[model samples]
Target chain A: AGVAEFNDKGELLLPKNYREWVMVGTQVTPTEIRTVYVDPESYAHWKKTGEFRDGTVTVKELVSVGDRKGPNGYFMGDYIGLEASVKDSQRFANEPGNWAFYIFYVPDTPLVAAAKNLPTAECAACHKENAKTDMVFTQFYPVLRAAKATGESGVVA
Target chain B: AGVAEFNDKGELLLPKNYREWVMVGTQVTPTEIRTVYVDPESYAHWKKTGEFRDGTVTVKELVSVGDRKGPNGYFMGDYIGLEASVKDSQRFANEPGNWAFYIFYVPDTPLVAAAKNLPTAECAACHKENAKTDMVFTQFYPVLRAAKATGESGVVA
Candidate 1:
């Protein structure tokens, strides 16, 4: 059985079932972003061995952006992002944006990795249905969408 | 200057100027990818409070479709991916991929946070040129070109 609902604004609202239909307001800003370079040899080692030799690792954190509001009131604030870079194989393996990340803050207390990793079912549930930015909608950052469309989606064929 | 090159086999080699190169043959496949899921709540707190808690992080390494290899030299060894789950705010953040990984014996060992952190320059350097997959030529994924009406040369708009 399907029923319809509306908001205080009397906007004829369809079930919030589809994240694509949510009202996303405001732009997530990149407050701070940086980049970390690596020793090509070290990176190659990891790709081949899965072990970083002592003092062979280097990192750079890129622009950090966050949004308090998601597509609608549906998704909440446990969000932090950074762009990662790596090199291993010369072909598809060394592509940029090959990896993207999102860290969810379940609790605001002391940082603890002991807690169970949050089940992001809700995030995926909605994303699979309605991701504006190449199926990963943050809305404002068009570049990221472009980045993902090329890297993660695997639609390049 | 527009020039054409050929591989040793006399096959007209396409320009892989940016990061757009295809992985044709190999002894192993890219399927057996293993991943370690980290605690997100603690991750956020470290960013917010600059303190790392001594909580035990559940490091469950799981493998998906990384068991067998096809006739090709490529055997889908292990699959490594990011967990992009949106948090409380509308700021949808997903999981981040690591610096290096394993591909059969050619494993991406000794992961480094710096290596996997900043790819903007790397991306811009090549993406600024001609990118097939929405400015990304890592794989064959091409929804952007279709959706945005862009061509082999990415539309920077």
Candidate 2:
């Protein structure tokens, strides 16, 4: 609901307004509709330089699939949770790549006001080796890829 | 599992081996992983000419999202169902747009051995109004977009 921030404890407070920002793209992982968004300021920078600026925040929303009684396509289901990340060299100076990740739940449980970053080994290592650009999966997101300042058609096998 | 075929009864048989063909793209709806595929011959035609040929078969698979205990991405769940369509001008001459739509189940209800085309008022009318390319949603599927022989970058508002 608030802008991306961390208290003195360095916990990333929930970013509730992220859905109002620029949508990066949509990814579906059977059972969930995962849509991604990034803060307006960061997206502006990405459009210009194809790189995120410090303090940039990204939020990913996961929603359960809804009913399907017919061939209609407007069946977007319920929100399940939110995953967010921020790039701040000063705040996460000691963290791998100076970026931190957080998760928030909804519906089934009250949404957490703030969440701790996941362990680096659990998330960072995988992103480091697999991500196509920075720590984000920009390769899979056409909206972001369309704004690339460099080669965008180099999707590799 | 089988090639797109219609018994004398006009039932479109389930296309089981469609996964082996060219993928059109991935689209996520909440609660489902709806990945789309097309038979190779038809796709090859599309690559050279931005249009589908008669007898073309397209399979859209819907799988459930699996357990996501961590930040990992490989959480594809179980088979929920399949939505398929075919283009056969003569066979569907009496139908609108010369296309027929069908639904298939998997891992739960035995994948319907064969399915009937949905009523024109249910699916075709919608596609007729919304689909961007030849009764298919090529605009939403990038894999198909990349091979277009026409103006690919002209994704319009």
Query: Model 2, range B5-79, lDDT digits (tens) per residue?
Result: 677887876664454355555555445556667887787677678888888888877666544433434333455
lDDT of 1 by residue, B24-130 (tens): 10111123322222233333333344332233121212222322122111112232322111111111122121111111111334322111212434333443354
Q: Which stretches of candidate 2 lie over 4 Å from their true place?
A: A1-157, B1-3, B71-74, B106-110, B149-157
Question: Considering every candidate listed, which one attains the maximal lDDT?
Answer: 2
Residues A65-121, candidate 2, lDDT per residue (tens digit)? 654433434333555777788888877888777778877764565577778898888
Give residue A64's error in model 2 in angstroms: 20
Residue A63 of model 1: what lDDT? 24
Return the interface RMSD of the candidates, in order shown, one decimal each.
Answer: 21.3, 13.4
TM-score of chain B of each: 0.23, 0.84
Which docking class does model 2 fall in? Answer: incorrect
lDDT of 2 at A92: 82
